[PDB]
């Protein structure tokens, strides 16, 4: 299919050429959407810059600053952050057509959109632990992260270098009572931080780790792709769910090729190509592929065990000073 894009915006995103990216998704995930993008609009030249969380916000802030030229689309896992940017005068304020079905939960408003719902998962290394030892549960973690054989075997989140790691593991901290006891035996067994996925699944698939908790599933899935030893368990005692928020700049040089790439992901096509190709768990229901809601509902025994956080000015409360420190100094407790 094609996105319902305006042919006018279409026209004004020609004669623009280009459409620069700031970007937290891994480029591996990425690829194929940005292939079947340059398919459908073969006349715009993509820059994919591929970068951390808190770099995104903090370049986008600086350049935006300097009067500099800066990305046309902001595209990344931190919500709070990307929240922050969107209710800050940063977002290009553009009603997607592909948007009309979006609960008003996973948008704000007309300036920042939803565009995936991805799990925070279990990742081991089958070599290590069998599926049938890995529990799905946080009080089941803690209890297995007691055994000697787990020191040193521990992989998740440093939620202080990583603002996704934050935002996934102050979620988990505000709705799950049992995330304490977890973190707590994270410093039991002596957990190792990581401030990117790809670290902490490198040490999981050498052995270094057997475990690693919080990671995304997307990239899980496109690892186990190439990598048959990389085991993924669902929580079933409930499982969060970020929603990587996409907004165009205000002061993109290129604001019509953004649309045009903003409903590509939101669309249909996108979204299945998310689905079925990226590995990219999607935000629409009526998909088809391995990375899902469908799939991930079923994998944690049903939509009530997902806590999908929502692209909210309500969320910015995690980056209130009080709010960081509650639960800053509970982890650094924890996990030492």
């Given at each position: 299919?094609?996105?319902?894009?305006?042919?006018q915006?279409?026209?004004?995103?020609?004669?623009?050429?280009?459409?620069?990216?700031y970007?937290?998704?891994?480029?591996?995930?990425?690829?194929?959407?940005?292939?079947?993008?340059?398919?459908?609009?073969?006349?715009?030249?993509?820059?994919?810059?591929?970068?951390?969380?808190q770099?995104?916000?903090?370049?986008?802030?600086?350049?935006?600053?300097?009067?500099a030229?800066?990305?046309?689309l902001?595209?990344?896992?931190?919500?709070?952050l990307?929240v922050?940017?969107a209710?800050?005068?940063?977002?290009?304020?553009?009603?997607?057509p592909?948007?009309?079905?979006?609960p008003?939960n996973?948008?704000?408003?007309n300036?920042?959109?939803?565009?995936?719902?991805?799990?925070?998962v279990?990742?081991?290394?089958?070599?290590?632990?069998?599926?049938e030892?890995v529990?799905?549960?946080?009080?089941?973690?803690?209890?297995?992260?007691?055994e000697?054989?787990?020191?040193?075997?521990?992989?998740?989140?440093?939620?202080?270098?990583?603002?996704?790691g934050f935002?996934?593991?102050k979620?988990?901290?505000?709705?799950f009572?049992?995330?304490?006891?977890?973190?707590?035996?994270?410093?039991?067994?002596q957990?190792?931080?990581?401030?990117?996925?790809?670290?902490?699944?490198?040490?999981?698939?050498?052995?270094?780790?057997?475990l690693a908790?919080?990671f995304?599933?997307?990239?899980?899935?496109?690892?186990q792709?190439?990598?048959?030893?990389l085991?993924?368990?669902?929580?079933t005692?409930?499982?969060?769910a970020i929603?990587?928020?996409?907004?165009?700049?205000?002061?993109?040089a290129?604001?019509?090729?953004?649309k045009?790439?903003l409903?590509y992901?939101?669309?249909?096509?996108?979204q299945?190509?998310?689905?079925?190709?990226?590995?990219?768990?999607?935000?629409?229901?009526?998909?088809?592929?391995?990375?899902?809601?469908?799939?991930?509902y079923?994998?944690?025994?049903?939509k009530?065990?997902?806590?999908?956080?929502?692209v909210?000015?309500?969320?910015?409360?995690?980056?209130?000073?009080?709010?960081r420190?509650?639960?800053?100094?509970?982890?650094?407790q924890?996990?030492?």
């Amino acid at each position: 299919s094609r996105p319902a894009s305006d042919p006018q915006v279409v026209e004004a995103a020609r004669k623009e050429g280009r459409l620069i990216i700031y970007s937290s998704t891994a480029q591996s995930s990425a690829q194929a959407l940005l292939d079947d993008f340059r398919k459908l609009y073969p006349f715009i030249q993509i820059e994919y810059n591929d970068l951390g969380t808190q770099a995104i916000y903090d370049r986008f802030v600086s350049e935006t600053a300097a009067g500099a030229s800066s990305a046309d689309l902001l595209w990344s896992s931190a919500m709070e952050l990307q929240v922050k940017l969107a209710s800050e005068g940063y977002a290009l304020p553009y009603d997607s057509p592909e948007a009309k079905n979006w609960p008003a939960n996973a948008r704000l408003g007309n300036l920042a959109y939803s565009t995936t719902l991805e799990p925070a998962v279990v990742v081991y290394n089958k070599r290590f632990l069998k599926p049938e030892e890995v529990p799905t549960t946080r009080e089941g973690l803690a209890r297995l992260l007691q055994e000697p054989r787990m020191r040193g075997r521990v992989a998740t989140w440093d939620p202080e270098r990583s603002a996704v790691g934050f935002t996934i593991l102050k979620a988990d901290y505000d709705r799950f009572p049992a995330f304490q006891e977890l973190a707590r035996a994270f410093g039991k067994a002596q957990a190792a931080l990581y401030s990117s996925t790809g670290a902490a699944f490198e040490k999981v698939i050498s052995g270094e780790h057997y475990l690693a908790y919080g990671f995304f599933g997307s990239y899980a899935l496109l690892r186990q792709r190439t990598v048959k030893d990389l085991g993924i368990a669902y929580l079933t005692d409930g499982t969060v769910a970020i929603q990587r928020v996409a907004f165009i700049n205000k002061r993109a040089a290129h604001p019509n090729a953004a649309k045009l790439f903003l409903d590509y992901l939101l669309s249909l096509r996108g979204q299945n190509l998310m689905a079925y190709t990226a590995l990219i768990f999607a935000r629409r229901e009526t998909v088809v592929g391995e990375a899902t809601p469908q799939a991930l509902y079923k994998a944690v025994g049903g939509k009530d065990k997902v806590y999908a956080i929502p692209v909210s000015t309500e969320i910015l409360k995690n980056l209130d000073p009080a709010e960081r420190m509650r639960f800053l100094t509970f982890w650094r407790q924890a996990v030492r």
